[PDB]
Each structure stands twice: as structure tokens, then as C-alpha cells.
């Protein structure tokens, strides 16, 4: 397949701990482990990692096809990182980072300050731009999408919290 024609090359600076089904990757700034399913046959062969679908679970081409895409992201996420910037377009809406906490100037009668978990070093260059930094590809989206779900992109003004690369489709009033 395309995934079978896709092996991943681990570089120096990220150590694997192959206890069979449980792999804990000792990396640069974290520990990106995934306890996969038993539809995989893993082997860090020489340097480039090779994998395999186990018999019986012949649908493990899917279940390890996740894994081939997975561990490639893990060895490049623990070292380099993800810049996940969000664009705050709100009338009187600010963003400021302190410790691991983000403020949410969100047009309410009360402030919303939610604490953010490990795997996050957040920053804020201004009141409308907010950095998020992380090692797992999941955690760099999950903490980002929760903020965006508190104020979705409003398609009559362009109001809302929105991603850096995301482009909304704002409409027009057309009646009054």
C-alpha cells in the first residue's frame, strides 16, 4: 500500500522503549507514548522503523496505518513543536498569558480563566494573538478547539475566536 510504502526514520535524539505493544518514546522535551492496538507488528529495524499488520486483524492495515502516521508525528513533535496561533476578533476582547493560565475577555458578566494542562507552554504577543506550544499533535488541538468552541466564528460580522490559518465565510444581512 501507500502506508506499506511509508516507513518512518527515527533520528538521533529520540529514544524508543520497545516493550512490544507498549512503546514509550524518550524524546527531547517530553515522553510521547502510545499504547497501540494488537493489530501491529513493530520493529525499529536498523534506524528506519518498519511495521506490520498482524494476522487475524487483516483490517490492521488501517489500525497500523494510523500508527505509521502516528509515530512520525511524535518524534518530530517532542523536538521541534507546533505553533498553534489563534486570532481573537472580538469587540473589546483580549488575551494575556500568566503561568499556564489564559484569560478570556469573552463578553460575559464574569471572567473566564481556565488552567491549561501539561504539554502546554502558552504565549500571547498581543491581546488578539495567542501562541500555543506542545509536543503531541492531539493536545495541541484539543486545548485550542475548546476556546474556539466558546465563541464560534459568527457568519454575519466575522466575530468570534478563529485559528490563524482558518478562513471564515461571513455573509451579509440582506433584509435590514
Amino acid at each position: 500500500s501507500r502506508v506499506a510504502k511509508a516507513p518512518v526514520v527515527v533520528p538521533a535524539g529520540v529514544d524508543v522503549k520497545i516493550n512490544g505493544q507498549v512503546i514509550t518514546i524518550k524524546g527531547k522535551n517530553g515522553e510521547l507514548t502510545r499504547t497501540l492496538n494488537d493489530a501491529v507488528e513493530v520493529k525499529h529495524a536498523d534506524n528506519t522503523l518498519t511495521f506490520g499488520p498482524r494476522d487475524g486483524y487483516a483490517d490492521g492495515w488501517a489500525q497500523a496505518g494510523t500508527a505509521r502516521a502516528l509515530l512520525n508525528s511524535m518524534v518530530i513533535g517532542v523536538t521541534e513543536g507546533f505553533t498553534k496561533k489563534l486570532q481573537l476578533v472580538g469587540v473589546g476582547y483580549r488575551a494575556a498569558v500568566k503561568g499556564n493560565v489564559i484569560n478570556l475577555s469573552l463578553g460575559f458578566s464574569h471572567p473566564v480563566d481556565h488552567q491549561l494542562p501539561a504539554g502546554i507552554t502558552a504565549e500571547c504577543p498581543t491581546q488578539t494573538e495567542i501562541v500555543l506550544k506542545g509536543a503531541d499533535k492531539q493536545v495541541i488541538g484539543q486545548v485550542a478547539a475548546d476556546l474556539r468552541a466558546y465563541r464560534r466564528p459568527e457568519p454575519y460580522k466575522g466575530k468570534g475566536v478563529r485559528y490563524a490559518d482558518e478562513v471564515v465565510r461571513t455573509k451579509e444581512a440582506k433584509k435590514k
Binding site: 469587540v91 473589546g92 476582547y93 475577555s105
Partner: protein
């Protein structure tokens, strides 16, 4: 006292959209909710306001320590604004003669008769934060009826001789007719303003642009609402030139054998036209 209310943005937005040259004076102290000081920059003094009272204090102090450098970089642009207003302050911006509070306004007041700079002030009307501050600039940056070019009655049709008349009481009388409201007591009313001269009570005030004779009744002043009968109208009051038989937009209110204005500029056009219809047939009679 609102979110998104950046003072330095808006005054420096005029230089982009309106294309003007504003140099502001009274700056901002406070993060818009704990806001307590308005930074007057000539005297370099912050003003305390009421805890929540409708108007107790006016307590002036120094520049606070949390804005000791933004007062530094903005005062040096204030004292620029007289070296390029008058040519005489050009050589003491660079020589280093002291630019006091009293010296700089003598140049900038003459920068209001040409109007290249406007004077800006941040504060709250409703939170009683700035209103007591805003009054002292009016006597020093807004012009007086005796400091301006006064009544200038030209002629009639003979020759274009524009004549600056006197702003004192030593002239023929002159006024103008505007804001001519109505009432179910006397009928027609006015909100007129006299520029110079004194009128007594009872006069043959004409309207010399449309050739009509009127007589000057019982003049009444207001608190914008309440009838207070102003008998003797001094030069500069605003009152109600009552009992005008016919009066148009902006004609003169002047005794004969005197200078005369004839001026109506920019007569508008009411555009949207809706047709009113009566309810009863007794209504169309009224």
C-alpha cells in the same frame, strides 16, 4: 470607561482617515475600569475624581510612577507644537529656554484662528471623570465673541466692502434668526443669539432681507426648558426674539439706519417624500 477604548489610537487615527494634525494634551491613567487620572500635560498634573459621587474632588497631584516615561515622550511633542505654530518659538525649542504652561498657550490660541490642530481630551461624562477638567480649556482654546472677527455687514448691491464692525456695545445693533421654534402660547418663538450691541424692550426690529416690519415683544430666556422673561438683552446672550410677523432662515434682526446683512448660504433639500392622509374628513380641514 469602556472596553476597546484606546485614547492614543483614535487621536492617531485622525492623521490617517481625516488627514488632520491633532496633538493631544490630556492623556490617560488607568486600565479603563480602575481609571482615576486624566493626564494634563502642560501643568503635568493628574486629577483625582469622585469615589462614585456626582462631583466632590478635584485633587491635583504629580504624574504617577506607573506612567513616568510616556509622560516624558509625549510632553516633548507638546512643546514641539509652538515652534512650528509661531516662528519665534523655533529658536527656543532648540536653545532651551523653558517652555512653561503659560507661554505655550499664547502661541496655540492663535493656532485656533486658522484651525490646523484640534485639542483632544479623554474622560467620562457619565462617570463624572473629566467634565470638571474640560471647562478650563474652553476659556483658553475656544474663541470668544470679542476675540474673533465680529459682525461683518457688507452692504446691499452697491459695492463689495466687507466691514468689520465692533464686538462691544458701541455699535449699531445686530443679530441673526435661527432655531425658530413654536409654541401654543404666543405662536412663533426663536432661539436667537445677539453678537454685539444692546437692545431695550420694545423695538421696531425689522428683517431687512425680505422687506417686512415687525415689533419686538416680551423676550424670554430659558434653562433650555423654563420661561424666564429676559427684558434687557446684553451683547452676547441667547434668547427668544418673540413676536416676529414673518421671519426666514438667517436674516437680520436690526434697527434701520444701520449696517445690513443679506446672507443665506446652503439651503438644503429634504429628499424623502411621504404623503400624509387624514383620518376623518374633519381632519383635512385641520
Amino acid at each position: 470607561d469602556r472596553m476597546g477604548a484606546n485614547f492614543l489610537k483614535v487621536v492617531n487615527q485622525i492623521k490617517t482617515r481625516l488627514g488632520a494634525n491633532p496633538v493631544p494634551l490630556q492623556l490617560a491613567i488607568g486600565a479603563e475600569e480602575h481609571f482615576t487620572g486624566v493626564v494634563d500635560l502642560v501643568k503635568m498634573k493628574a486629577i483625582n475624581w469622585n469615589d462614585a459621587d456626582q462631583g466632590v474632588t478635584f485633587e491635583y497631584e504629580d504624574i504617577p510612577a506607573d506612567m513616568v516615561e510616556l509622560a516624558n515622550e509625549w510632553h516633548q511633542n507638546l512643546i514641539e507644537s509652538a515652534a512650528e505654530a509661531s516662528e519665534e518659538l523655533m529658536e527656543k525649542y532648540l536653545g532651551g529656554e523653558e517652555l512653561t504652561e503659560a507661554e505655550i498657550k499664547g502661541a496655540l490660541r492663535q493656532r485656533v484662528l486658522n484651525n490646523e490642530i484640534i485639542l483632544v481630551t479623554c474622560g467620562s461624562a457619565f462617570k463624572n471623570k473629566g467634565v470638571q477638567a474640560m471647562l478650563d480649556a474652553v476659556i483658553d482654546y475656544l474663541p470668544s465673541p470679542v476675540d474673533v472677527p465680529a459682525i461683518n455687514g457688507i452692504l446691499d448691491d452697491g459695492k463689495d466692502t466687507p466691514a468689520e464692525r465692533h464686538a462691544s456695545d458701541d455699535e449699531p445693533f445686530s443679530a441673526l434668526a435661527f432655531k425658530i421654534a413654536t409654541d401654543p402660547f404666543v405662536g412663533n418663538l426663536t432661539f436667537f443669539r445677539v453678537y454685539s450691541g444692546v437692545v431695550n424692550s420694545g423695538d421696531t426690529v425689522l428683517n431687512s432681507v425680505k422687506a417686512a416690519r415687525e415689533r419686538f415683544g416680551r423676550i424670554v430666556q430659558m434653562h433650555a426648558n423654563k420661561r424666564e422673561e429676559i427684558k434687557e438683552v446684553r451683547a452676547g446672550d441667547i434668547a427668544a426674539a418673540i413676536g416676529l410677523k414673518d421671519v426666514t432662515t438667517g436674516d437680520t434682526l436690526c434697527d434701520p439706519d444701520a449696517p445690513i446683512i443679506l446672507e443665506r448660504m446652503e439651503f438644503p433639500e429634504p429628499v424623502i417624500s411621504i404623503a400624509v392622509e387624514p383620518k376623518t374628513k374633519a381632519d383635512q380641514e385641520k
